[PDB]
Write a protein that binds this ligand. Structure first.
Ligand SMILES: Cc1cc2nc3c(=O)[nH]c(=O)nc-3n(C[C@H](O)[C@H](O)[C@H](O)COP(=O)(O)O)c2cc1C
Length: 116
């Protein structure tokens, strides 16, 4: 199965990506070398809804799962709608270890309804 996903380590400064799937490299047009150690916000740009970024920030703060749809940009500046699902990952002792982020490319929710 095709899986667009990244794993971040929230126990390192600014939640860096420590793993990016082949499909994530393909979608975003970045090499693994350009992604590893970055915060995933580098995919955002002018058209990204700051209200949606806020919802993600709060979900990471409270270590809660969330799904949002937001505008991201490939290396070559191509806009794509990203249906982004965030999942906290806890160790055996219930301590946060990682976040996993799974991307789906597509305008799943029409922009006119998303904007409401
Ligand atoms: C595992 C994981 C995957 C993420 N994937 C994306 C993504 O694909 N696109 C995106 O815009 N933001 C993504 N983010 C969110 C940003 O890295 C950042 O948390 C968000 O923009 C809110 O924080 P900020 O306001 O400090 O940027 C992801 C976050 C995590 C933890």
């Amino acid at each position: 199965m095709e899986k667009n996903f990244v794993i971040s380590d929230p126990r390192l400064p600014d939640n860096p990506i420590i793993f990016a799937s082949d499909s994530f490299l393909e979608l975003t047009e970045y090499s693994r070398e350009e992604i590893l150690g970055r915060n995933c916000r580098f995919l955002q740009g002018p058209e990204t809804d700051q209200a949606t970024v806020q919802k993600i920030r709060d979900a990471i703060r409270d270590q809660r799962e969330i799904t949002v749809q937001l505008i991201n940009y490939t290396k070559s500046g191509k806009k794509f709608w990203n249906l982004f699902h965030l999942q906290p990952m806890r160790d055996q002792k219930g301590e946060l270890q990682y976040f996993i982020g799974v991307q789906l490319d597509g305008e799943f929710i029409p922009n006119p309804l998303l904007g409401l």
